[PDB]
Amino acid sequence: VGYQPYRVVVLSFELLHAPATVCGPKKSTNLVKNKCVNFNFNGLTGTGV
Amino acid sequence: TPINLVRDLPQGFSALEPLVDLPIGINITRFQTLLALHRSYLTPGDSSS
Numbered sequence: 001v002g003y004q005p006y007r008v009v010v011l012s013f014e015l016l017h018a019p020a021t022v023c024g025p026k027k028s029t030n031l032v033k034n035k036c037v038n039f040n041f042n043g044l045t046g047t048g049v
Numbered sequence: 050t051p052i053n054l055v056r057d058l059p060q061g062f063s064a065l066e067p068l069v070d071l072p073i074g075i076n077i078t079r080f081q082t083l084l085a086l087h088r089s090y091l092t093p094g095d096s097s098s
């Protein structure tokens with residue numbers, strides 16, 4: 001078993017001054033309307049209908 | 050924008066809607082354009098004269 005071939009893949013992640021290009025998945029809750037709710041559409045934390 | 054003229058660009062107004070966005074983050078100070086020339090049967094086909 002120890003002499004059998006094994007495939008090894010190594011992942012490396014680095015940070016530079018460039019804007020981030022690789023991002024993980026995001027979640028999305030259901031849209032409720034005509035009610036005083038709070039939303040955050042990527043630019044503001046607005047509360048309202 | 051379609052137009053029917055050779056020179057002396059018209060005084061009409063036409064805004065420029067945005068196009069694709071490049072998140073590169075590099076240095077830039079110089080630029081140059083690219084042109085296309087034709088090699089028909091009239092020309093000998095050499096890029097000298």
Ligand SMILES: *[C@@H]1O[C@H](CO)[C@@H](O)[C@H](O)[C@H]1NC(C)=O
Pocket residue numbers: 075076077078
């Ligand atoms: C190019 O960008 C780098 C960092 O973004 C900066 O240090 C450098 O001075 C820039 N070069 C020029 C010619 O502006």
